[PDB]
Amino acid sequence: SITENTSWNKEFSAEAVNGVFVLCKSSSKSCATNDLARASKEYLPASTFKIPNAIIGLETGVIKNEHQVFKWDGKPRAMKQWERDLTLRGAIQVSAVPVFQQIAREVGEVRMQKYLKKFSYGNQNISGGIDKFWLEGQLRISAVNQVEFLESLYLNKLSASKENQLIVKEALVTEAAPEYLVHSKTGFSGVGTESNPGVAWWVGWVEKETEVYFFAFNMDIDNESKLPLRKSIPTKIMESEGIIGG
Amino acid sequence: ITENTSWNKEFSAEAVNGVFVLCKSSSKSCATNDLARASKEYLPASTFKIPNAIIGLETGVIKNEHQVFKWDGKPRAMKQWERDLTLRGAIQVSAVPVFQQIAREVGEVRMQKYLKKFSYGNQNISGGIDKFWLEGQLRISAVNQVEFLESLYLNKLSASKENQLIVKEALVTEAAPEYLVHSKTGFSGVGTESNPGVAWWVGWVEKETEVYFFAFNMDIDNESKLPLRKSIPTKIMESEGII
């Protein structure tokens, strides 16, 4: 079940942006959102697909284990930050596309199609090129579907070993305090134009004391400088609900 | 293991007697400020929550990573412990009473078996099942701490990989895209001037594609000296570029 709270639009409106935030306390049976219609609307996952891709890589044996090093060959990459050896965690956190494109090629379409069926991952459309379907292809997923998937991973309920789900979970840790732990992943398809905006994402979950909150945010992005709102808007909404600190 | 006596400069301003052990990549490449004290065995205090947590999970006393340890509402020694805690929570705030009840449910026979398996110090759990790591005869060295933590890091402990991974996420204390610290503090008490307590900070640091295993302990007879257990080792590691 999901409820609409359209007074969460004032963080979007104050920054002049079109987007959705979905927040669920304890499980996905208790979700709220600022926009019910946008919550179910399906968007290119962009680098939030590294979550499922890493699990699939581990399940198929393409990624050997938690300590595998993805070595840089010396050939130039898009980002200088990607030009280095990377652990699984490092590649996910710096969002190293070329590493996941190679994983995806090794997985192959047949196997990638199988696991996205098992994970109920959006429209499950990986057509058009096996190393770009999440970056510029036909794959689409909603904020609600992101929360469902992440809740599954949290509980170790995906069709994968518990070990592999735990390995990916530690790789998604982005904030840590004794009684506050955040697992998250950003995504960004690209700066679009005003009429054909790109999409930006922030998805994950927060464990605060003994409670858990699943979240998924997306927004239209048509200006490079508005990228940081993918975290600031969700933070302020979560802060207004009392989740951050006290 | 090699000796680096220039690291003694980090102990001298606060007049700390203690040892740091630091290993790059594996436990066959270690260095320390004091080779003598590196092998010397001390009460583990709350660093024993690492093995205790694994054993709790292995035996089924702890059901899984999402078990909540509800507070019964009865007085505890620290205010930070007076609340429901997750497994990670209880390790991170070092909630003794939670692990005391865990140790009772594991029991002496099972506790003995797992500490032999883990090669954990002198393996002496005498003096009461719920206080042996705090007040008892259990002793472990900094070198033995690094060897144990390396085994955990590689999933080589005799426990399920799942359970080892569960405890590892509970030890995360610092996180960045290419920098991850797993750690646990320990503090046995102030003892006396003549027979001081011991404080610990143990764990490992992942920077880029390298891993560093570390163990620090120090004599302590005043509670105001406590944060030196992390700042001395932090200063040493930062001076070697681990930061």
From Swiss-Prot, chain A:
Record-level Gene Ontology MF annotations: beta-lactamase activity; penicillin binding
UniProt-annotated binding residues for a beta-lactam: 95, 186, 188, 230
Record localization: Periplasm
Protein name, entry field: Beta-lactamase OXA-10
PROSITE patterns reported in the protein's UniProt record: BETA_LACTAMASE_D
Catalytic activity: a beta-lactam + H2O = a substituted beta-amino acid
Keyword NADP among UniProt keywords: no
List of residues that carry N6-carboxylysine: 50
Record text on activity regulation: Activated, with respect to most beta-lactam substrates, in the presence of 0.05 M sodium bicarbonate.
Active site per UniProt: 47 (acyl-ester intermediate)
Outcome recorded upon mutating residue 137 to D: Increases resistance to ceftazidime about 15-fold in P.aeruginosa strains PA01 and PA14. Increases resistance to ceftazidime about 30-fold in P.aeruginosa strains PA01 and PA14
From Swiss-Prot, chain B:
Record-listed a beta-lactam binding positions: 94, 185, 187, 229
InterPro entries attached to this UniProt entry: Bact_Transpept/Beta-Lactamase (IPR050515), Beta-lactam/transpept-like (IPR012338), Beta-lactam_class-D_AS (IPR002137), PCN-bd_Tpept (IPR001460)
GO CC entries: periplasmic space; plasma membrane
Keyword Disulfide bond: yes
EC number: 3.5.2.6
Protein family according to the UniProt entry: Belongs to the class-D beta-lactamase family.
Protein name in UniProt: Beta-lactamase OXA-10
Gene: OXA-10
